[PDB]
Every structure is written in C-alpha cells, then in structure tokens.
Amino acid sequence: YAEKVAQEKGFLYRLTSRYRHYAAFERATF
Secondary structure, three states: OOOHHHHHHOOHHHOOHHHHHHHHHOOOOO
C-alpha cells in the first residue's frame, strides 16, 4: 500500500473501508 492515490484525491477520500482495511494489516502494529 502507498500514500500516492490517497494524498492525490484529498482527505475525505482516505476515509474509506479499503483504507481502514490496509491500515489494519499493513499498519497492524503501527
């Protein structure tokens, strides 16, 4: 996962299920 498409769109965009998902795996401990 990368923060490219994220910052690209904006802030509200980041607020999505997909984002919350990868955040649990990719950033499990962090």
